[PDB]
C-alpha cells in the first residue's frame, strides 16, 4: 500500500509583519491552489514526523527513533489555498519547508 | 584538461622534478606507467586515448622539459613547460606531437631571426623596500621630526 | 491568418462566468469588449457579457441587425445548433473532461485493470511490428 495521508508543506507562522504569533501555523497543502476548494481538508488531524537520537515507544509496535507532534486544521487562509493549523505543541521552527502529513481519517463524507 | 599521455622513456633529469628529495626517495615515479607502452594491451587502450583527443580536444599542448646536463648551473632539476602547437587540423596537429615525442627540439625549429619575441620571467628581487624606493614618491624636506 | 470572425449572427462559447458551458449567440456589438448576446435554446438571457468570456465557434446564424427572441429562436433551430454543436469534435472533448470528473472509485478501478490489459496488447503487437520494420529495411 501507498501513502494514506495527503502531502502538505509547512510554510511559516501566522505573523503580522513583526509580531510573529507563534501558535498558529500556515500550511500549504499540495494540490489545493485556490480557496473554496479548501473546505474538504479543514478539520482533519495532521502530523509532523521526524526522527531523533533516543528511542521512543510506538503504539502498536516496538520502539524506534520516530517522534511525531500531532495537530489539526482549523480554518482557511488567504485566497491561494493555505490553511491555518493549531498544533498541540507549537512546531519547532526547524521545519519551515519540510513535510507535514495531512491525514484523511477525521472524515466528512 | 581532457587527457594526458606521457612518453615511455622519461629522462631521469625530468623525474627529478616531481620530487622534493632525490637523496631521500626511492625514485619510483612513472614506473607503473612505463608498462602501457611495453605490452600490447595498453597500446589498445593508449591508441584509444589519442583517437579520442582527435575528435574532442580543440587545442593541444606538449610538455617539454629542458636539458640540465649541459647548463653550467648548480641545478639538476629540469623545467617542465606546456607548449602549444598552432597549425592545421587537430588530427595532423596530434600526429605531429606523437611523432616529435621523446625527441630533441632545437631553437631554430621554433623561432627565426629578426623576429619579435616576448620575454616572460620573474623579475629580480630587492626585498622589503620603503615607499621612496618602491613607488618613487618625493622625499619630504630634511627637517621633518620623524621618518623623512 | 484569421479564419473566425465576430459578426452579427455568430455563435460563441461561454467559458468564464456564471454561464460557462453554454453556447450563446451574438446579436449586436456595443464596444470593443462587451457584446450584446443571447441564447434562446441554451436557456440564457439577453444580456451583454465581455468578449473575454467567449470562445468563438465556426457556426453562423442569420440576423438583420438586432431582433426579438422570437426571430433568434427560429433561425437558431432551423440550423440545429443544439445538434450541430454536439456532433463537433470540440464538444466530445468537453464531455470527456465531464465524464472523467464523474469517475466513481469502483469505476476508476475498472479503468486501472482495463488500461492495464490494453497496454500489454500494444506492447507485444508493437514488437511484432518492430521486427518486420527492421526486417524490411534490410
Amino acid at each position: 500500500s501507498g501513502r494514506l495521508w495527503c502531502k502538505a508543506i509547512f510554510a511559516g507562522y501566522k505573523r503580522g509583519l513583526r509580531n510573529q504569533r507563534e501558535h498558529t501555523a500556515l500550511l500549504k497543502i499540495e494540490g489545493v491552489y485556490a480557496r473554496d476548494e479548501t473546505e474538504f481538508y479543514l478539520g482533519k488531524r495532521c502530523a509532523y514526523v521526524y526522527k531523533a537520537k533516543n528511542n521512543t515507544v510506538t503504539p502498536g509496535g516496538k520502539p524506534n527513533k520516530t517522534r511525531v507532534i500531532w495537530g489539526k486544521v482549523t480554518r482557511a487562509h488567504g485566497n491561494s489555498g493555505m490553511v491555518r493549523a493549531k498544533f498541540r505543541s507549537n512546531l519547532p521552527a526547524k521545519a519551515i519547508g519540510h513535510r507535514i502529513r495531512v491525514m484523511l481519517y477525521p472524515s466528512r463524507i | 584538461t581532457f587527457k594526458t599521455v606521457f612518453a615511455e622513456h622519461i629522462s631521469d633529469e625530468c623525474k627529478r622534478r616531481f620530487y622534493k628529495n632525490w637523496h631521500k626517495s626511492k625514485k619510483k615515479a612513472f614506473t607503473k606507467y612505463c608498462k602501457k607502452w611495453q605490452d600490447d594491451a595498453g597500446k589498445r587502450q593508449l591508441d584509444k586515448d589519442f583517437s579520442s583527443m582527435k575528435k574532442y580536444c580543440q587545442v593541444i599542448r606538449v610538455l617539454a622539459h629542458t636539458q640540465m646536463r649541459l647548463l653550467p648551473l648548480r641545478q639538476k632539476k629540469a623545467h617542465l613547460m606546456e607548449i602549444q602547437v598552432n597549425g592545421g587540423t587537430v588530427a595532423e596537429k596530434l600526429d605531429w606531437a606523437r611523432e616529435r615525442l621523446e625527441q630533441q627540439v632545437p631553437v631554430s625549429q621554433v623561432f627565426g631571426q629578426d623576429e619579435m619575441i616576448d620575454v616572460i620571467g620573474v623579475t629580480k628581487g630587492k626585498g622589503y623596500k620603503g615607499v621612496t624606493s618602491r613607488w618613487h614618491t618625493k622625499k619630504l624636506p630634511r627637517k621633518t621630526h620623524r621618518g623623512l | 491568418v484569421f479564419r473566425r470572425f465576430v459578426e452579427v449572427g455568430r455563435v460563441a462559447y461561454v467559458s468564464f462566468g456564471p454561464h460557462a458551458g453554454k453556447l450563446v449567440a451574438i446579436v449586436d456589438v456595443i464596444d470593443q469588449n462587451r457584446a450584446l448576446v443571447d441564447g434562446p435554446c441554451t436557456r440564457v438571457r439577453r444580456q451583454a457579457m465581455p468578449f473575454k468570456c467567449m470562445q468563438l465557434t465556426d457556426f453562423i446564424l442569420k440576423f438583420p441587425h438586432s431582433a426579438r427572441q422570437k426571430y433568434v429562436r427560429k433561425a437558431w433551430e432551423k440550423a440545429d445548433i443544439n445538434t450541430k454543436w454536439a456532433a463537433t469534435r470540440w464538444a466530445k472533448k468537453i464531455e470527456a473532461r465531464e465524464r472523467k470528473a464523474k469517475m466513481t472509485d469502483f469505476d476508476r478501478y475498472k479503468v486501472m485493470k482495463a488500461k492495464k490489459m490494453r497496454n500489454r496488447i500494444i506492447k507485444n503487437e508493437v514488437k511484432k511490428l518492430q521486427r518486420a520494420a527492421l526486417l524490411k529495411a534490410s
Binding site: G97 | - | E95, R99, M103, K110, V111
Partner: protein
C-alpha cells in the same frame, strides 16, 4: 520531484519572483538556458542599466565594492538572491537549492523542462513593446563565452532532433498497431471512452 525550468522566452523579474517562492518552500528548482531570458524595455536602455552597475564599486577593493558577476547564469542567480533573505540560515540553506546553468549541461539535457507561463514574454508583453535578450546584453558587458556556448547548442539541437525523429517514428507504430489489433481489444477500448478517455 525536481523542477527543470526552461528559461527561453521568460522575463527576468517575473520568473525570479516565482522561483524565489518555490525555493523558500523547499522544492529543488534548477534553471537552464538563462542566456535566452528576455527583459522588458529597450536594449540600449538596459545596457545603460548594467553599465550603471559596473560603476557602483569602490574600485580597487572587492571588500568595499560589490561583485559584478557577468555570466548570465550568475546574473539571474543574483537577481534571485535579492528576492530571498540571505542573512538568515534558512536564507542560505534555501538559495543553495536553486542551481543556475548556461545552455544545458548533460545531466539536465535528457530531461523534460517545464516553462512558467506566468512570466512568459508572449503573455506578459504587448506585441509592440520592445525587449532585450539576456545573451546579447551579457555578451556586451564582458561575457567571454557567447561563442563557446553557441556552438555547443548547435551540437545539442541536432542531437535532440535525432531523438525526436526516433520518437515520431515510434508513435506511428503504436498508432498503426491499434488498427492491427482492433479486432481483439474491442471490449477494453469501449470501457475507456465510457469513462471519458480517448475521445
Amino acid at each position: 520531484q525536481v523542477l527543470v525550468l526552461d528559461g527561453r522566452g521568460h522575463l527576468l523579474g517575473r520568473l525570479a519572483a516565482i522561483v524565489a517562492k518555490q525555493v523558500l518552500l523547499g522544492r529543488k528548482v534548477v534553471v537552464v538556458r538563462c542566456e535566452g531570458i528576455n527583459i522588458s524595455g529597450n536594449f540600449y536602455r538596459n545596457k545603460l542599466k548594467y553599465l550603471a552597475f559596473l560603476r557602483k564599486r569602490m574600485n580597487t577593493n572587492p571588500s568595499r565594492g560589490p561583485y559584478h558577476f557577468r555570466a548570465p547564469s550568475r546574473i539571474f542567480w543574483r537577481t534571485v538572491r535579492g528576492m530571498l533573505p540571505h542573512k538568515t540560515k534558512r536564507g542560505q540553506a534555501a538559495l543553495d537549492r536553486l542551481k543556475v546553468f548556461d545552455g544545458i549541461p548533460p545531466p539536465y539535457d535528457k530531461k523534460k523542462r517545464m516553462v512558467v507561463p506566468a512570466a512568459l514574454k508572449v503573455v506578459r508583453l504587448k506585441p509592440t513593446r520592445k525587449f532585450a535578450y539576456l545573451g546579447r546584453l551579457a555578451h556586451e558587458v564582458g561575457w567571454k563565452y557567447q561563442a563557446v556556448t553557441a556552438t555547443l547548442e548547435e551540437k545539442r539541437k541536432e542531437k535532440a532532433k535525432i531523438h525526436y525523429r526516433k520518437k515520431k517514428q515510434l508513435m506511428r507504430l503504436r498508432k498503426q498497431a491499434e488498427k492491427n489489433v482492433e479486432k481483439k481489444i474491442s471490449k477494453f477500448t469501449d470501457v475507456l471512452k465510457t469513462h471519458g478517455l480517448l475521445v
